[PDB]
Design a protein around this ligand. Structure first.
Ligand SMILES: [Cu+2]
Ligand SMILES: [Cu+2]
Ligand code: NA
Ligand code: NA
Lengths: 620, 620
């Protein structure tokens, strides 16, 4: 019944049938993106209209199309032909990745380069990577992938240990042509293996770890209804899944007495960019938009009970489309569970003689994706006290290169001759706010230091100031950790019992933003990543900070174009976009497989409630 | 057998007997501090000599003394008379708390102030607070406490809900005189109760929480020997306890193959200060040095199984001295346990077909203390991957005031008429480093942005720079979150297999430091709190960042005096002092009892190991 339910296998098959009947999905067509559209604004609106958005690629070279379908009514709502040289290429297809290595294996320039290095072409794996937009005029309007080579000594070998530096090739994956092969010189291929399951490298496994058993004898405290609606410890929300964004949270609300109070209408990671900081021409083009170019939901892992998710686990198995419009289930792709989270509140009072302790817990919703060498975990947490938190966990195998003789200012050494280029991992969280409803505003809060003198004679006073962001042109903000800068999202028309507007405060980690030169291609394509906070007025078609078509798209779309409308955001339906990320100078301990590192943000209530919301938690 | 074992009841008893026989512990004497001294520097220290340091107060007004005794040989090593106007007063005694309320109850100015407010003196509780050093010349050389009043409507009532604003008294606790009563005007006493166990306020308790059972069917993975020596997952350390600092970690080392490698020689929270930012003369003097003035270890809680510490818990019960030299056990005062910590490392590799997941764990050592209205949890964590982390958890009841009509720039409103002054909670971690031994140095590492141009034609490059801190005069450092600033502690004489010095990287949270005006009394007395990082050359008498006698010391003691020696710290026995803290603008959700908020820091290996140290963790 719910309009926010997960897409079903039948819905995806029905989209396929509708597209076929309409003449839009013949043998030369491929589905590059398919996802369900959120309901338009309007409580109630259509009784039920499930609409899907589809990006359709054509392998013969014809123009691709963007199509909206109503599965409820069996109709195509709109279909537009795309001019990709203008608006961007479609996301990379999984079938295009394998094309790269196969085409290079028969190219005489590639074979000549490998022969100069005494490498057997049958052992050379090619990582197929997104191309970006640089100086090559022949790439405009064409679907290009760039390939970097790694040697696999045997079928179970980790090829990442053996980069073939000095060599890169560019491939047109539609016409099946190798456009350029660039060879800047022979580097030694690092010889040490990186096989982290080889006993020669692990040594004998530890026998010292005793088991930790986490069980829930009476079952979990949350309920799941309608497939994806969660109720847990006064929280209410719907768990969505989109092949581009991954897990999406809808309708986050908190039951305060007899009233269900909205907090966030939609929360997602709407883009993530991984820019590399090595100026070598072999890699200076390298920037992954994992969300916009690759689609992170497509590569979600099946999560194993007792290994990936420990405890009393409830799974969701989302369904996505393959490239022909057939439904594909990602079995056990989303883990949901609650976990203990230490002390919630504690006080031992001398005067009253009362000793009081309560324990905290959090609800966890997570998925993991694998994009080539990297593996990312996406974790959303809900806490008893009203806190909402997101955490990204980065692991996998670092991307490698040769380590130059004489050293490098842009590459770490991991092993003899083996380097790891400096890079960042930067996320954009899109928070469609609904603090007690849709009339919201954002204030920037800084600590204020005060000078000793009249009215502050002992020089101890300090204060704070809040600045309302009234229009989009002034809502592009930077962090300032020194002044304790945070941002408050409040509802000026909903007041707590002290007659103050209810609100939530966003706490950032204040990590560095995009480091690239402001004139670079990546700074223009990932403009969102250059500032910590953006606020826009809600609009149906403003979904991603980088725009709809990120692959091989120059600047011109996304947040800088949205903000130019300079719309009123003071007590309006607004969207917060928060940039946060990790700057990775790889260390020896990251090799041969990287221990998890983390980054995130959290939101805490700020006068949203009339007192602590966890006074009714029992002692157990 | 270990020199680092916890003090035993028998040692305390022997100290008391030694003091009594020497004539140093008469009926007018009180022990204000007693603690075991660490062994002096010596890699061949063989002869056991357990020495105790004692501060002895005199309730009749004679000069206090600092005494060092040898329990092994039964002798007084040294005894020095103290001039407290010069070097500071002794820590506050628990028995002096009651004296403030009792002395005021018979003072005619206090009673007249209560009578004007129609308050029954039998219902007025007085918080006994440290005095600091301000403008009152008559206080120099005298033990002063200041008192603020709260109303308790009945014996089980939370008095913090009912502050009596506009009134403060100063008390000489040795001569038992009330030196000043200041009445600045009548404020209404807030009338709502804050009784968080009263069903009228909590409402009906939730019935929705199902149990989470955490067990270890084969017992824990760590071992405890000699009372306080821990071995866990390659880590080795000794858990100490001092009545001033609380839990202290000694000899933190990691077993790398067949080598026990030192990392940290001694880790402690060596001071914590809570400065208030309300310029009212009723509170503008208010600054708690919880460690230095009150001694956080003596107020440690007994921790209850299943409530404070959940899981398979191993307890330590440290012994301290009471004011007369009798041993007092703090039953179950330290919790130790391991806990699951999610994914450690994960990769699914397309080319090799190998799917790999390992789980992480951490060892937790914790204690909880209560200082008046505040309760603080101190948590040390050791992770499988070599990470060391500290976390402070702040809860309890916020300190309250009246909320003025018209509002305030320095006080939050929590309930009708009820305010909570702005304040900070600032900690100093003292890390006596020993990275692979005692020859260490500190480098400051900043991210370096690069301009687009020759050698960086695409404008993507970025780098980093490291600056060695070579002398104490240049080793007072500030955070810079925008440039990703961290500090590396390395051993220039111990290299990894890549011929780079081994090291550990300190990651700070980059929260604001002390906000008070630089000319203020608190800025002089808590100078450590004005900067994020200090490095000193080790000296055995440089123990606290605020000096030995913090109470009513006029300023400059501790770190500013130490670093003025300008000693060589480039490849030497060094100590890192990290300042970190919470800036607390109280929110309505903090009332009537505050949900935990946290702050801390962590250290991660940086080329300490020759590759990841967790390759030998099994799948389980
Ligand atoms: Cu990385
Ligand atoms: Cu506080
Ligand atoms: Na909104
Ligand atoms: Na040292």
């Amino acid at each position: 019944a719910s309009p926010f339910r997960l897409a079903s296998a039948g819905e995806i098959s029905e989209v396929q049938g509708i597209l076929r009947t309409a003449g839009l999905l013949g043998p030369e067509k491929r589905i590059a993106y398919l996802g369900v559209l959120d309901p338009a604004r309007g409580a109630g609106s259509e009784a039920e209209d499930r609409r899907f958005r589809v990006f359709i690629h054509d392998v013969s070279g014809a123009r691709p199309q963007e199509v909206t379908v109503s599965v409820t009514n069996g109709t195509v709502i709109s279909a537009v032909e795309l001019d990709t040289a203008a608006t961007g290429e479609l996301p990379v297809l999984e079938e295009e990745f394998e094309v790269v290595e196969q085409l290079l294996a028969t190219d005489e320039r590639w074979l000549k380069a490998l022969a100069a290095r005494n490498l057997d072409v049958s052992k050379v794996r090619v990582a197929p990577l997104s191309a970006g937009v640089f100086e090559y005029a022949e790439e405009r309007g064409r679907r290009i992938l760039r390939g970097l080579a790694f040697v696999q000594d045997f079928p179970e070998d980790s090829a990442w240990a053996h980069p073939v530096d000095g060599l890169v090739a560019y491939v047109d994956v539609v016409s099946k042509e190798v456009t350029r092969v660039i060879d800047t010189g022979v580097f030694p291929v690092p010889a040490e293996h990186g096989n982290y399951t080889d006993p020669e490298l692990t040594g004998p496994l530890r026998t010292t770890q005793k088991p930790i058993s986490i069980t829930q004898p009476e079952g979990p405290s949350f309920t799941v209804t309608g497939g994806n609606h969660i109720e847990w410890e006064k929280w209410s929300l719907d768990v969505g899944f989109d092949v581009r964004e991954g897990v999406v949270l809808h309708n986050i609300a908190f039951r305060d007495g007899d009233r269900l109070r909205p907090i966030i209408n939609r929360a997602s990671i709407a883009e993530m960019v991984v820019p590399y900081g090595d100026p070598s021409p072999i890699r200076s083009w390298q920037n992954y938009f994992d969300t916009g170019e690759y689609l992170v939901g497509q590569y979600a892992n099946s999560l194993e009970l007792g290994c990936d998710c420990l405890g009393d686990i409830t799974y969701l198995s989302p369904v996505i489309s393959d490239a022909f419009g057939n439904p594909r289930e990602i079995r056990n792709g989303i883990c949901m569970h609650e976990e203990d989270w230490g002390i919630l509140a504690k006080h031992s009072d001398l005067w009253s003689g009362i000793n009081y302790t309560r324990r905290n817990r959090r609800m966890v919703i997570s998925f993991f994706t694998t994009i080539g060498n990297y593996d990312y975990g996406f974790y959303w947490y809900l806490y008893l006290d009203g806190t909402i938190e997101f955490e990204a966990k980065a692991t996998g195998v670092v991307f490698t290169s040769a380590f130059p003789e004489g050293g490098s200012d842009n590459i770490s050494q991991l092993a003899p001759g083996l380097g790891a280029p400096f890079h960042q991992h930067i996320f954009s969280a899109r928070l469609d706010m609904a603090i007690d409803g849709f009339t919201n505003r954002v204030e920037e809060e800084d600590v204020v230091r005060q000078t000793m003198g009249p009215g502050n004679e002992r020089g101890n006073a300090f204060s704070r100031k809040r600045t309302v962001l009234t229009r989009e042109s002034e809502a592009v903000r930077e962090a300032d950790a020194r002044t304790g800068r945070t941002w408050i999202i409040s509802n000026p028309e909903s007041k707590n019992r002290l007659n103050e507007p209810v609100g939530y405060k966003l706490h950032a980690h204040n990590q560095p933003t995009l480091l690239a030169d402001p004139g670079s291609s990546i700074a223009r394509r990932a403009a969102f990543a250059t500032k910590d906070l953006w606020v826009t007025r809600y609009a149906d078609d403003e979904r991603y900070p980088t725009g709809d078509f990120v692959n091989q798209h120059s600047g011109g779309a996304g947040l800088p174009s949205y903000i130019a409308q300079d719309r009123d955001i003071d007590g309006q339906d607004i969207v917060v976009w928060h940039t946060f990320g990790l700057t990775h100078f790889p260390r020896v301990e990251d090799w041969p497989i990287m221990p998890v590192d983390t980054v995130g943000f959290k939101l805490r209530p700020e006068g949203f409630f009339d007192r602590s919301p966890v006074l009714d938690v029992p002692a157990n």
